[PDB]
Design a protein around this ligand. Structure first.
Ligand code: GK6
Length: 349
């Protein structure tokens, strides 16, 4: 049955939410939504509430709304953000116009950790183990993150980690331009649109994150796309014939061949003092040819994680139907599908 809703304005935005959510306080805003911290009096949890901005104003926006709702309703894993609640003030499809998503409040991220704390080898093990455990689950459903970086990893006081996506706007060209953390974690094949990419892009990003936890410094802090490519190839070596053939962009292929050939560096001399097992795992993640990178499931069994690995407690996902991705539909059609998913939501136990 329908809860009672109350109204308030916070930063020239109307919020209409069930009474159970108290003490709304703005924590972020962007082209695709606005977020408030709140207290859920029904569960006793600190929560985040996201109000989608203009969810049905174009086909593009309407498909994106449906996409996020489908993804959050599916994800049920300890190291991955889940959906606590979803609501609308609308009493019918006819008046349906706003969509609110509720999750655990994710109050500290990994950027805060690396910036403000001393991490031991054991901390690195636990944190990277959790990211790989979550990635095994997400990848098992053929979901690719594509934007893993420290700011998308939430870490509580007990060092327990969840993967999310805080982005409240679009990755435009301008956004990826210059000396920016928005690009430092991206696999080269997407940075430079070399070929059709796949889930292995996320493993490149984990390699970058793990190196920064070990040294305290960004692995590839490029001043632009080309400077960053040079930093990468200096470390892992210029590509060979086999990889070159796989770069389907004739243009990208011709540029990379203009560069003086360089060998792969000695990672023990780059990561001075690091656990040899950590050096070995980084060599297996930071491979230019995405075909040859270690997978998340493979990495969980690597000797580096012997202290944490439990093959009976690394679950996979239920089948995830994303046939909708291929479908062209009108706005009112995407809006109706979204409504059906709002109406059918069942809270976690
Ligand atoms: C409330 C909410 C609702 C939905 C989403 N969406 C996602 O996290 C999301 C959206 C799309 N894909 C994923 N993935 C992709 C695959 O990997 C798993 C996560 C995750 C995020 C949030 C959210 C949750 C918490 C916070 C938050 O705590 N903000 C505080 C501010 C200091 C930072 C902000 C936003």
């Amino acid at each position: 049955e329908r809860p009672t809703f109350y109204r308030q304005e916070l930063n020239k935005t109307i919020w209409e939410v069930p009474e159970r959510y108290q003490n709304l306080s703005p924590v972020g805003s962007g082209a695709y939504g606005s977020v408030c911290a709140a207290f859920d009096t029904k569960t006793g949890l600190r929560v985040a509430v996201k109000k989608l901005s203009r969810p049905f104003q174009s086909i593009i926006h309407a498909k994106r709304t449906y996409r996020e709702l489908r993804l959050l309703k599916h994800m049920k894993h300890e190291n991955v953000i889940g959906l606590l609640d979803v609501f609308t003030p609308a009493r019918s499809l006819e008046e349906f116009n706003d969509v609110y998503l509720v999750t655990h409040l994710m109050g500290a991220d990994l950027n805060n950790i690396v910036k403000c704390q001393k991490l031991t080898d054991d901390h690195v093990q636990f944190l990277i183990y959790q990211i790989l455990r979550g990635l095994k689950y997400i990848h098992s459903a053929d979901i690719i993150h594509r934007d893993l970086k420290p700011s998308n990893l939430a870490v509580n006081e007990d060092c327990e980690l969840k993967i999310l996506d805080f982005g409240l706007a679009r990755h435009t060209d301008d956004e990826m331009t210059g000396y920016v953390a928005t690009r430092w974690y991206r696999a080269p094949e997407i940075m430079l649109n070399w070929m059709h990419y796949n889930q292995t892009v996320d493993i490149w990003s984990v390699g970058c994150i793990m190196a920064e936890l070990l040294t305290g410094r960004t692995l590839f802090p490029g001043t632009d796309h080309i400077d960053q490519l040079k930093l990468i190839l200096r470390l892992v070596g210029t590509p060979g014939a086999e990889l070159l053939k796989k770069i389907s962009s004739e243009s990208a292929r011709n540029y990379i061949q203009s560069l003086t050939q360089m060998p792969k560096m000695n990672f023990a001399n780059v990561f001075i003092g690091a656990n040899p097992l950590a050096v070995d795992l980084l060599e297996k993640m930071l491979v230019l040819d995405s075909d040859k990178r270690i997978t998340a499931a493979q990495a969980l069994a690597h000797a580096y994680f012997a202290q944490y690995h439990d093959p009976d407690d690394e679950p996979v996902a239920d089948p995830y139907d994303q046939s909708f991705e291929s479908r062209d539909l009108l706005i009112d059609e995407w809006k109706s599908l979204t409504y059906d998913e709002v109406i059918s939501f069942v809270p976690p136990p």
